[PDB]
């Protein structure tokens, strides 16, 4: 779900993903991002719609 949303997004420029097992009962998905211009406006929109 996460990867599909990020891949086709029109407000993301560069992206990467990874997954970690925090412990026996948690999973951590990490995403590295760089947005298109304007930067902070798109950052706020992304964090709002994620």
């Amino acid at each position: 779900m996460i990867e599909r949303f990020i891949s086709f997004s029109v407000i993301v420029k560069e992206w990467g993903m990874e997954t970690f097992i925090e412990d026996e009962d948690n999973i951590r998905f990490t995403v590295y991002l760089n947005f298109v211009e304007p930067e902070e406006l798109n950052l706020s929109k992304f964090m709002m719609v994620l």
Binding site: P38, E40, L41, S44, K45, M47, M48
Partner: protein
């Protein structure tokens, strides 16, 4: 039980505060405020009308010398004679030009008018308590009169309800579409600004377009980004706005905040060398050019930006900017948590109009129209002629008279229920109607109506379902004058600015303080609680000169402090809880002194026991439901509560207070009981023989003795609505079924539940016809003077006054199937003759008449049994009424049983230990235990007969008896429930509903029976009945039912070529259209209804030609047929 005594103390009269009758007090003042004070302020104006040159040549209109006077006759004289009850108001008008000169002021009169001796304005006058008006300070009060009515031009009594204002006090939220929201609000000038100014703003937000977060109106303000507008008004940075908005919000809203702020910054940077003032000025100039305004740019800009927020006029711009910021904050919060923001149907954001406000608004509107018309006339006269002449006949017709007449007729803006003719069903209606509140078309029971409106008193059917509510006995509506408003506001501002000098300038992380939505300060959060507490204490001591000020602390995340002082707010008294402590319990002297003190004395001498709280403040507080539940909590639990409520019996209306123990029954029964309690017949009027009006009156009234306190203080009990009768709960020969009742003949003969119906008749006669000299059979009851005789009985064909048109009688006729006695006759002679007659008739119960109890057990008379045909007890008592017992337990009306028991107890010992008559308190919303009632009844019986066996005492307490069969004198199988109860008679009578027709008139267009019971019309055979008859298979029956009467047949011919009804010329059938074309078509006879011909002709009018053929089947012959058996082979 001290709380019950304190509640009682509020319902009794309070002479020290000028309260002589609590139930309607707030209405009287609402009118005394208008007729005495507000009218003078509205009328007394001194305004420019036109200006010339440059503010040195202007015409001025001034109004002064306003006087108001009352009539010279009592309202009873007005009712009898047929006059009207109005007060007369007169004023003087000056129109004069003024020229500004360095020497001072130049005045040149142009016109002046006066109304010293004229009906310049006629204002309807309120009758009020004791038949006493605010203008007349007489010293005689008519007892048993509470007033609350008006008398219109035609001598008709009128009564009205309260209405909810269209302008709310909280902004309205709405989801325009997915991810697209709007937020609309309004601004209005303070009371002391004539004329009042209005503004209506809307904020639009859309997730897809965050650069268009725009505030707008209609042709009165620019469309600008709200963040930049706040920057302009308050002169602060964008980062400041970000920090202010995202201070104490949940993290989900902060993302939206950041997006909005960054969008605003992007707009800012898209313009080279951005400057806020230039931005605003460019927008203003673009708007100016878009419109065709002829003002200079400076005038346009000043007008736009100076009247930005009328309610906050004469304050710096920074406070306006902060007000905008707080509105935006609430907008965002409601976007993300919609269910926690006051809904639009909530009573938290509404206010209510009383009697005075209707008249105030109408006066405002008419004065404005008057001045506008004068200005237009002067402009036209200057345009055509010269010298600026003011035409007469335009400054002598203010137009108030027509407005007030239309108001009393039932027209007020877009509402049509404000006023109506008073239907004289009950004495309690005088209370019920003035205390109603209507809402514009919402039908669900909102939680905010609880405790301030009666829960059970609402319409049960019709178009008004769920749109009319009734105040509780303890609720009221605030009034306030203009001078008092100003003084109170000034005191509040002085207190805020004096006691909190260092901590009212936060503006970034504080709580904005508003007075009537006017931001005046911003408080340090760490001090909010104290500020409220210290405030409320000062409120209760009268420190501000007013005990009804409302203070609300909103804290979810909106973080606001709201103070309300205006008029039109709902307020109730509450018990105070101060620092986890009930003040009522720490005031020992109050219990000893309560007897000799009034409500205001308690407020003055024992503050902090009771606080007057309005609805908005209530909705945000923590309130304990009862004193008993409070006393059962730990101190830590107690520390969380601000108020404590009164017993439940104070949460009902005055109508619902007629019933008993409504909380022991089902709710639908309560609704029905409230609906019918108003239709019971009572002692309607003290002027039974004087007033010429319709009505119904109870003949031998009795005062109920199982009542609540509200029924005693309102005087509903002292005016009676029934009688005490003996009832038995049993089946009688299977006759009393499906709510029918058996009634006793000797009870009816002796006067049981006997009523009198009175009716009013009125006619107008041209003088010649009245004086015309010819004895028709309709003039048997007429005296030599052409008027009906006193005390005579009129029949269904009699006339009341001679009216001959010239040698024909054209007088109106009496049209009731029963007779009536002529009680009073009044005549007025003018160009015409006006005759009014009052007739009366006594109506003992008969089959079909309708009765009920106070628990909604309604039934009609099904049989009139003789005294010797009824079961009797060992004392020889037979019941006056017999009701089937099964319905009592299938409908679950338990309280009824209890009522009977208590009534029986009252009969055994009806006096105190001092020997005084002692009613029994059984309130609606009881709260007392059944066991205690049984113990009271047991004590009563034991006092009565000290020597009773246990079985006898139990039978008496439970109201059980062995009854005997009159025919055989033998007991029945088991004991019966048998005892006295207060019984009511409703106004639905059989002879008022009977109808029959044999032959009569017809409607001209279609030639069918006419309509109207009073006009001898027929009953309508609907098409559902037609479907039913077709379901039986009876074709001939319905065919003959839908056809014209066989006695109205006639020969009609139709042309087979074009379908026209052939005319008959010189006895020859001929189709004119076809004859003109040299044709010889066949004419055939038809048998149809008249309406069919009308319909077809009208269809021919529109251009459609309808042609009919006829069947010419060849002849047929009968032939013998062989036999057939059809039985089986067995």
């Amino acid at each position: 039980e001290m709380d019950q005594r304190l509640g009682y103390k509020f319902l009794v009269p309070d002479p020290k505060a000028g309260v002589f009758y609590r139930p309607l007090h707030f209405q009287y003042v609402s009118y005394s405020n208008f007729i005495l004070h507000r009218l003078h302020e509205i009328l007394t104006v001194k305004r420019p009308l036109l200006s010339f040159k440059n503010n040195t040549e202007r015409i001025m209109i001034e109004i002064s010398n306003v006087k108001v006077t009352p009539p010279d006759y009592s309202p009873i004289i007005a009712s009898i004679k047929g006059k009207s009850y109005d007060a007369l108001a007169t004023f003087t008008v000056n129109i004069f030009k003024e020229v500004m000169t360095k020497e001072g002021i130049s005045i040149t009169k142009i016109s002046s008018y006066e109304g010293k001796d004229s009906h310049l304005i006629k204002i309807p006058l309120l009758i009020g308590y004791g038949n006493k008006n605010p203008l007349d300070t007489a010293k005689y009060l008519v007892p048993n009169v509470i007033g609350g009515v008006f008398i219109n031009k035609q001598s008709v009594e009128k009564v009205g309800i309260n209405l909810v204002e269209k302008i709310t006090t909280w902004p309205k939220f709405r989801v325009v579409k997915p991810n697209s929201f709007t937020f609309s609000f309004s601004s209005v000038s303070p009371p002391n600004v004539l004329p009042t100014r209005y503004r209506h703003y809307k904020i639009s937000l859309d997730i897809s377009q965050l650069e268009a977060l725009n505030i707008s109106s209609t042709k009165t303000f620019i469309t600008v980004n709200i963040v930049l507008l706040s920057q302009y008004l308050s002169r602060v940075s964008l980062e400041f706005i970000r920090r202010s908005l995202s201070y104490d919000m949940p993290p989900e809203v902060v993302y939206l905040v950041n997006a909005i702020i960054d969008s605003a910054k992007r707009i800012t940077e898209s313009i080279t060398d951005f400057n806020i003032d230039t931005y605003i000025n460019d927008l203003v100039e673009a708007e100016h050019i878009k419109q065709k305004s002829q003002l200079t740019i400076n005038e346009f800009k000043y007008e736009m930006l100076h009247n930005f927020l009328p309610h906050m006029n004469y304050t710096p711009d920074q406070l306006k900017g902060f007000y905008m910021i707080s509105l935006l904050r609430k907008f965002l919060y409601c976007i993300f948590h919609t269910s926690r923001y006051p809904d639009r149907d909530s009573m938290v954001c509404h206010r209510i109009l009383t009697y005075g406000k209707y008249f105030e608004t109408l006066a405002h509107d008419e004065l404005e129209n008057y001045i506008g018309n004068i200005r237009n006339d002067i402009m036209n006269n200057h345009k055509n002629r010269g010298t600026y002449a003011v035409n007469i006949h335009v400054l002598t017709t203010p137009g108030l008279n027509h407005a007030f007449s239309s108001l009393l007729s039932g027209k007020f803006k877009k509402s049509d229920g404000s006023y109506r003719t008073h239907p004289h069903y009950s004495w309690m209606q005088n209370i019920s109607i003035p205390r109603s509140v209507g809402f514009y078309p919402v039908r669900k029971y909102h939680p905010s109506q609880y405790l301030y409106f009666c829960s059970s008193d609402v319409p049960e059917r019709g178009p008004q379902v769920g749109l009319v509510s009734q105040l509780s006995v303890l609720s009221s509506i605030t009034n306030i004058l203009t001078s008092e408003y100003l003084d109170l506001e000034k005191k509040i501002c002085e207190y805020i600015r004096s006691y909190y000098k260092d901590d009212i300038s936060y503006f970034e992380t504080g709580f904005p303080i508003t007075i009537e939505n006017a931001l005046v300060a911003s408080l340090n959060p760490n001090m909010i609680c104290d500020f409220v507490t210290d405030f409320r204490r000062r409120k209760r001591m009268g420190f501000f000169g007013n005990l009804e000020v409302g203070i609300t602390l909103v804290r979810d995340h909106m973080n606001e402090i709201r103070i309300n002082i205006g008029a039109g707010r709902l307020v109730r008294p509450f018990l105070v809880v101060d620092n986890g402590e009930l003040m009522m319990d720490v005031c020992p002297e109050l219990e000893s002194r309560l007897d000799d003190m009034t409500f205001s004395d308690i407020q003055k001498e024992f503050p902090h026991v009771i606080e007057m709280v309005d609805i908005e403040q209530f909705t945000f507080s923590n309130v304990c439901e009862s004193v008993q539940k409070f006393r059962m909590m730990s101190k830590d639990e107690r520390k969380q509560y601000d108020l404590c409520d009164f017993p439940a019996e104070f949460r009902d209306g005055y109508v619902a207070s007629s019933l008993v123990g409504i909380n022991h029954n089902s709710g639908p029964r309560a609704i029905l009981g409230c609906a019918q309690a108003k239709q019971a017949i009572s002692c309607l009027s003290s002027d039974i023989r004087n007033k010429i009006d319709n009505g119904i009156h109870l003949m031998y009234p009795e005062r109920p003795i199982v009542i609540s306190k509200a029924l005693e203080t309102s005087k509903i009990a002292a005016n009676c609505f029934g009688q005490h009768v003996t009832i038995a709960l049993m089946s009688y020969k299977g006759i009393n079924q499906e709510d029918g009742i058996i009634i006793k003949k000797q009870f009816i003969q002796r006067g049981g539940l006997d009523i009198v119906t009175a009716k009013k008749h009125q006619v107008e006669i041209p003088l010649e016809n009245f004086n015309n000299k010819e004895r028709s059979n309709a003039y048997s009851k007429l005296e030599s003077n052409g008027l009906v005789r006193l005390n005579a009985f009129l029949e269904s064909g009699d006339a009341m006054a001679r009216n001959i048109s010239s040698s024909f009688d054209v007088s109106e006729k009496y049209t009731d199937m029963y007779k009536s006695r002529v009680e009073r006759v009044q005549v007025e002679l003018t160009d015409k003759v006006k005759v009014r007659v009052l007739t009366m008739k006594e109506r003992r119960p008969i089959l079909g008449d309708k009765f009920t109890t106070r628990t909604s057990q309604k039934g009609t008379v099904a049989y009139v049994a003789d005294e010797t045909e009824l079961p009797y007890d060992e004392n020889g008592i037979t019941p006056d009424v017999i009701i089937n017992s099964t319905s009592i337990f299938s409908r679950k009306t338990i309280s009824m049983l209890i009522e009977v028991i208590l009534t029986a107890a009252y009969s055994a010992k009806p006096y105190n230990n001092k020997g005084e008559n002692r009613p029994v308190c059984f309130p609606s919303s009881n709260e007392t235990s059944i066991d205690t009632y049984m113990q009271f009844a047991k004590q009563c019986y034991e006092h009565s007969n000290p020597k009773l066996s246990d079985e006898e005492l139990s039978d008496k307490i439970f109201c059980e008896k062995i009854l005997y069969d009159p025919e055989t004198d033998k007991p029945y199988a088991s004991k019966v429930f048998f005892g006295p109860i207060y019984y009511l008679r409703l106004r639905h009578l059989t002879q008022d509903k009977a109808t029959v027709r044999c032959r009569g008139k017809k409607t001209k267009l279609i030639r069918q029976a006419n309509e109207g019971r009073k006009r001898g019309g027929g009953i309508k055979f609907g098409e559902m009945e037609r479907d039913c008859l077709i379901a039986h298979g009876a074709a001939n029956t319905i065919t003959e039912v839908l056809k014209d009467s066989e006695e109205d047949y006639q020969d009609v011919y139709v042309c087979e070529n074009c379908g026209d009804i052939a005319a008959q010329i010189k006895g020859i059938n001929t189709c004119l259209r076809c004859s003109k074309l040299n044709l010889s078509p066949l004419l055939t006879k038809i048998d149809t209804t008249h309406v069919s011909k009308v319909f077809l002709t009208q269809m021919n009018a529109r251009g459609v030609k309808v042609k009919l053929d006829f069947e010419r089947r060849p002849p047929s012959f009968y032939k013998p047929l062989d036999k057939v058996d059809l039985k089986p082979s067995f």
